[PDB]
């Protein structure tokens, strides 16, 4: 009965709220406002990669901190070389609408996706010295948002049909499907041990999934608008979300409650990309004001501006060793900072 | 052999650069459109009659997927691309950001079903004021003009029932009606046109405009009209860089 289920849902929500309140004792910022801040940090561009025509939606660093791949709306996939700014490969795309890309851990495969509901995987160890689409994946009923390789034979995809699934490269079927979201999933990030991952959707709520079984372990709320990006802490026990309400927040899996609320007064723009650093201390983010503010972890105060882009910033990433920091915007340019 | 290896790589970078240089002049020589309508608006039919303007390849039919691009139809020796969105979900407030640099947006309105006319009116207002779709002009098509006639001619009409503003509406003097038409049908035909035009008046200042047209189900001048409107759009953009407008 609807009415019966109404009281059950209300009681469950009240119990969850009471459990959250019981575990809360004091705020972290007020109880630890003694340590010195990191100061003001400034970067400057060192390399500027050119060649793309239209805007750029995604990019991914390699596992050697020397090769990176970028996807643009012009329909071209380009593999760069940050050391000498010399291109290596240029793979034309079957469809001109691409919204995501990925790099294999072994440096032998890539991925792409967009408005077309098919994910394409390309091989870079070909005998003919060229490139060839090996496998294509079908089954989603919505535009793809993000995809990250897990190994040489598994991949995780996100789509706009409120579903997430895990595929098999050798033979293409949905080995596991994760359902429960209400809005469209926008981003996801795999854990360092490839045991769990999180994904935010267009419902102001996040979730945690188990790649093995497929159950939704935890769910977190707090935001007041759509979730646009999500990252993963290097330790494997935290993540940050950037929404369209011009606010940034941090969550802890064990605490199950938000800790930091990074905000300001004069900024009204939605977050577009979020990434951490090697030390888990310098959180980088994108904005609609054509900037990329470097915020902190415990400081909570923009301590660096990455101005220099004349259009919207859509993608952001950092190397595994942290030596270089890359960026990309809608002006079809890439910049590398130090 | 550092130089030798570096030379191999430099040579490679120059090869993958000539291809990009060749593709740059092809990318900028075509126009991208975005056609979107309603479930019952004649959208499909219009897309089907542009086919007449454009183991090998024959009737390429792939899997049921999204982003159904048309026949790369072209007219007057210039290429046009049109993207008919399909097989998507109801919500469209997120993927609409992709078409922020298209030449124009084609909007099709079913001006024969009075019931949902007002619900179609809102979508045009929402797309007009969007921040991303703020410098992109829109082309308006009023489809199914034949069915309108019958309506006003039958009994059960009452077009001021869902719109009690028709009572005082007088036909504009500038209105050029077609020779051999009826006064009643001229009043109804032009009373819907300025409904959409009033929304376009707000947030104007020459940033973008709207072009209305009285199209039909089997009209063959659509590709002409689109070409003329795109030509008008391109010319106005160039003049604004020389501060002439």
């Amino acid at each position, epitope marked *: 009965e609807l009415d019966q289920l109404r009281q059950e849902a209300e009681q469950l929500k009240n119990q969850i709220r009471d459990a959250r309140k019981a575990c809360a004792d004091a705020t972290l910022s007020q109880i630890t406002n003694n340590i010195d801040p990191v100061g003001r940090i400034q970067m400057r561009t060192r390399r500027t990669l050119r060649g793309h025509l239209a805007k750029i939606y995604a990019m991914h660093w390699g596992t050697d901190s020397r090769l990176l791949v970028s996807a643009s709306q012009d329909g071209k996939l380009i593999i760069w070389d940050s050391y000498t700014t010399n291109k290596v490969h240029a793979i034309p795309l079957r469809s001109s609408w691409v919204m995501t890309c990925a790099y294999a851990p072994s440096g032998n495969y890539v991925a792409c996706g967009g408005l077309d509901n098919i994910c394409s995987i390309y091989n870079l160890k070909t005998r003919e010295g060229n490139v060839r689409v090996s496998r294509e994946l079908a089954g989603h009923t919505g535009y793809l948002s993000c995809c990250r390789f897990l190994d040489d034979n598994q991949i995780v995809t996100s789509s706009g049909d409120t579903t997430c699934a895990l595929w098999d490269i050798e033979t293409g079927q949905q080995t596991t499907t994760f359902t429960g979201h*209400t*809005g469209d999933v926008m981003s996801l990030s795999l854990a360092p041990d490839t045991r769990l991952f999180v994904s935010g959707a*267009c*419902d*102001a*709520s996040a979730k945690l999934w188990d790649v093995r079984e497929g159950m939704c372990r935890q769910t977190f*709320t707090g935001h*007041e*608008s*759509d979730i646009n990006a999500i990252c993963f802490f290097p330790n494997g026990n935290a993540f940050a979300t950037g929404s*369209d*309400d011009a606010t940034c927040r941090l969550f802890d899996l064990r605490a199950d409650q938000e800790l930091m609320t990074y905000s300001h007064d004069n900024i*009204i723009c*939605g977050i577009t990309s979020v990434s951490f650093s090697k030390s888990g201390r310098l959180l980088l983010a994108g904005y609609d004001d054509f900037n990329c503010n470097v915020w902190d972890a415990l400081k909570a105060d923009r301590a660096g501006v990455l101005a220099g882009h004349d259009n919207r910033v859509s993608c952001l990433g950092v190397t595994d060793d942290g030596m270089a920091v890359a960026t990309g915007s809608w002006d079809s340019f890439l910049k590398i900072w130090n | 052999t550092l130089s030798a290896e570096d030379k191999a790589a430099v040579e490679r970078s120059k090869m993958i650069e000539k291809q990009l240089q060749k593709d740059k002049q092809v990318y900028r020589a075509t126009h991208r459109l975005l056609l979107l309508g309603a479930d019952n608006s004649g959208k499909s039919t219009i897309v089907k009659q542009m086919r007449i303007y454009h183991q090998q390849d024959v009737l390429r039919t792939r899997v049921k997927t999204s982003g159904i691009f048309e026949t790369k139809f072209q007219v007057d020796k210039v290429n046009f691309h049109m993207f008919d969105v399909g097989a998507q979900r*109801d*919500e*469209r*407030r997120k993927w*609409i950001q992709c078409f922020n640099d298209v030449t124009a947006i084609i909007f099709v309105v079913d001006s024969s079903d009075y019931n949902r006319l*007002q*619900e179609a009116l*809102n979508d045009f*207002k*929402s797309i*007009w*004021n*969007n*921040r991303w779709l703020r410098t992109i002009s829109v082309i308006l098509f009023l489809n199914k003009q034949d069915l309108l006639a019958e309506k006003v001619l039958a009994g059960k009409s009452k077009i001021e*029932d*869902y*719109f*009690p*503003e028709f009572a005082r509406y007088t036909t504009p003097e500038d209105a050029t009606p077609e020779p051999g038409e009826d006064p009643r049908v001229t009043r109804a035909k032009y009373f819907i046109r300025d409904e959409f035009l009033r929304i376009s008046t707000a947030s104007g200042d020459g940033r973008h405009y709207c072009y209305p047209h009285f199209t039909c189900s089997v009209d063959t001048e659509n590709i002409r009209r689109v070409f003329n409107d795109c030509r008008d759009i391109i010319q106005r953009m160039h003049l604004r860089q020389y501060e002439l407008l």
Partner: nanobody
Framework: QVQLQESGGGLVQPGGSLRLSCAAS????????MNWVRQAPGKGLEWVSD????????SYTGSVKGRFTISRDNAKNTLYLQMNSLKPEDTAVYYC?????????????????????RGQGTQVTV
């Protein structure tokens, strides 16, 4: 999460001068656009009226004009939807709608099938 609550609906004598008030929590009420959406039985969703951020700009659906009123109230965090001169077709379910983005005058997905920031709805009858 974000929860929207409305009340005042039910069964009442014709010409009862119904009261419709929307309760909001979990977000800043002074930063979003408020709309009104109705779903009559036997057909889909319909849009009725909208209000500006500060209540300046006001628009109405052509069918119902000069019989309904809207009043955004920031201090009390309620809405005023007094009405009169009922019609037999007015029997429907009213849903309190919201706007996903702040600091913006327009936003889609107000009449979507599976929207999120929409009220639970109340039943009214003549």
């Amino acid at each position: 999460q974000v929860q929207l609550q409305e009340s005042g609906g039910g069964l009442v004598q014709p010409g009862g001068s119904l009261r419709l008030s929307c309760a909001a929590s979990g977000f800043t009420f002074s930063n979003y656009k408020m709309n009104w959406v109705r779903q009559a039985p036997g057909k889909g969703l319909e849009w009725v009226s909208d209000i500006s951020q500060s209540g300046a700009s006001i628009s109405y659906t052509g069918s119902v004009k000069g019989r309904f009123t809207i009043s955004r109230d920031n201090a009390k965090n309620t809405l005023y939807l007094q009405m009169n001169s009922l019609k037999p077709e007015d029997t429907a379910v009213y849903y309190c709608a919201r706007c996903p983005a702040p600091f913006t005058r327009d936003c889609f997905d107000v009449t979507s099938t599976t929207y999120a920031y929409r009220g639970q709805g109340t039943q009214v009858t003549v």
